[PDB]
């Protein structure tokens, strides 16, 4: 019974719930790791020890938050939960395969946990670049385990990418065109395509790294005629699409949240919005090298990559401005989710603006490998991707559970986290302009002030993720059942009540062919 339901599932709703549960827990581990990082940097000196134990921590932080919290939650959680409901499908195209996608995750996570236990773990950076990641500077099972964890997580994500594209394309009502599906669905259909094309190149890269250190190959070893830079190309070819794969579903949720709380029927410029994500997804494939400005490449190619990278601002701009245009004549409701949506719009703008700066190779020479880049991506990840997750979570919680959250508490939670993340990452812009490198367990005396303030902010964030856990408990402890939902005419996900039954759309949906 429990087994059949929870271990042998073929239900998009239950698999989606299983994901959210996996993502939340992984989110705890990643938070703990981020605290050890700021604990180590909150006072001049060494708390843990050498850059090895420290960088092992920094590496797990990245893998956990990227592959085990953000991706599972947005794509597996909201993806599986909402997609079928938004297009009127009974389930997904491949219910069984969908389950394997999920179950591949816990093992993948185990391998990553195991890696930091055996030997001295993997202090290579999330980019696990060779020669440091090689069998000399990093002998032992650790890196190998890190590689296998990544293989599984990749197999999991492209299998799911296959499911979402097939479902989304093949399972909509016969009269509904693609230009009739909601932005969130478009958002995951496009993210699914990026995963399908980038993930395999990564697997090609790390498999080459695996043979280099166990089978005596020399793909990245100069001795045999290899090239450590070749790994950089392969990794980053996936590495960039990967960050868009991380923000796109967030773009979608934001479009849904802003529109709903503005009391609007639809988002402003729907086709412009579809065009924008498609452009973003595409340009995202031809700019990888901006991560290699100080590697010794030709000035000309270095010029190409700074330009190519900059044009991504245009489409992203039409999206920011569209969400604003959406708020326009709206009847605004200051709900928790709307608060998260507004924060995202601003904070993400700042963080992406800061990324345009780094787009310049000349300036990037002095900005690369410093805390400026740590600020850039935490703005777009800690107050971009994450803010979307929170807005979507508080907005759809009633649909998933049937129960409601205490809005006041939910608002308190935003206030605390908003202060925390800004205090944590704002100072870091300075540390980076002033020269503080990345991946250091200690720094020259001058960087003491900002690092201190920065670490204090991380403690406020800790407070907020603790409160959230409680906020979820209370919701489930009180049991206020949902009664009425607004704007369902334009929001299908809610039409079957909270929570929708195990089997929805048993009998299709009627859509006329005008």
């Amino acid at each position: 019974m429990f087994i059949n339901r929870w271990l042998f599932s073929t239900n998009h709703k239950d698999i989606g719930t299983l994901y959210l549960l996996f993502g939340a827990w992984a989110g705890m581990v990643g938070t703990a790791l981020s605290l050890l990082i700021r604990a180590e940097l909150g006072q001049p000196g060494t708390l843990l020890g050498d850059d090895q134990i420290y960088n092992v921590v920094v590496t797990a932080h990245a893998f956990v938050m990227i592959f085990f919290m953000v991706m599972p939650i947005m794509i597996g959680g909201f993806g599986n939960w909402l997609v079928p409901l938004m297009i009127g499908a009974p389930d997904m195209a491949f219910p069984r395969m969908n389950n394997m996608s999920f179950w591949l995750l816990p093992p993948s996570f185990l391998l990553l946990l195991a890696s930091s236990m055996v030997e001295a773990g993997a202090g290579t950076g999330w980019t696990v670049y060779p020669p440091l990641a090689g069998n000399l500077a990093h002998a032992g099972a650790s890196v190998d385990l890190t590689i296998f964890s990544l293989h599984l997580a990749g197999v999991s994500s492209i299998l799911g990418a296959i499911n979402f594209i097939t479902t989304i394309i093949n399972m909509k009502p016969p009269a509904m065109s693609q230009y009739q599906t909601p932005l969130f669905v478009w958002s995951v259909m496009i993210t699914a395509v990026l995963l399908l094309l980038s993930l395999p190149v990564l697997a090609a890269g790390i498999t080459m790294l695996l043979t280099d250190r166990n089978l005596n190959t020399t793909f990245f070893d100069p001795a045999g005629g290899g090239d450590p830079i070749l790994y950089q190309h392969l990794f980053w070819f996936f590495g960039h699409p990967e960050v868009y794969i991380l923000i796109l579903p967030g773009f979608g949720m934001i479009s849904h949240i802003v529109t709903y709380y503005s009391g609007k029927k639809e988002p402003f410029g729907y086709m412009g919005m579809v065009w924008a994500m498609m452009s973003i997804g595409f340009l995202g494939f031809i700019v990888w090298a901006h991560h290699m400005f100080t590697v010794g490449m030709d000035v000309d190619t270095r010029a190409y990559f700074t330009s190519a990278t900059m044009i991504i601002a245009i489409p992203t701009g039409v999206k920011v401005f569209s969400w604003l245009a959406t708020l326009h004549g709206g009847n605004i409701k200051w709900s928790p989710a709307m608060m998260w949506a507004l924060g995202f719009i601003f904070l993400f703008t700042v963080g992406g603006l800061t990324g345009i700066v780094l787009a310049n190779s000349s300036l990037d020479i002095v900005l690369h490998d410093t805390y400026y880049v740590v600020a850039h991506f935490h703005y777009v990840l800690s107050m971009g991707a994450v803010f979307a997750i929170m807005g979507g979570f508080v907005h759809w919680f009633p649909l998933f559970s049937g129960y409601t959250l205490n809005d006041t508490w939910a608002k308190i939670h935003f206030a605390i986290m908003f202060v925390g993340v800004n205090m944590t990452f704002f100072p870091q812009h300075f540390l980076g302009l002033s020269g503080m490198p990345r991946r250091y367990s200690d720094y020259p005396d001058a960087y003491t002030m900002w690092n201190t303030i920065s670490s204090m902010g991380s403690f406020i964030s800790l407070t907020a993720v603790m409160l959230m856990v409680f906020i979820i408990w209370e919701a489930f402890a009180s049991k206020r059942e949902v009664l009425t939902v607004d704007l369902t005419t334009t929001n299908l996900e809610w039409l079957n009540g909270c929570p929708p039954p195990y089997h929805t759309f048993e009998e299709p949906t009627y859509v006329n062919l005008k």
Binding site: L110, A114, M117, V118, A141
Partner: protein, 56 residues
């Protein structure tokens, strides 16, 4: 040759309230349990090895 898909269609369409991976008999069941056993055991064995390798 044969052609008896018609017999199997009937066997598998039979309303015995059994899941497809068991709808076919007793062997389905032994195969299932063997597979399940090896997997769980293996998983246990793997955890042991990791606990073992964690130490110097």
């Amino acid at each position: 040759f044969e052609n008896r898909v018609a017999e199997k269609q009937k066997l598998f369409q039979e309303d015995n309230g059994l899941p497809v991976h068991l709808k076919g008999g007793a062997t389905d069941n032994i195969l299932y349990r063997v597979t399940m056993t090896l997997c769980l055991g293996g998983t246990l064995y793997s955890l042991y090895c990791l606990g073992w390798a964690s130490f110097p």
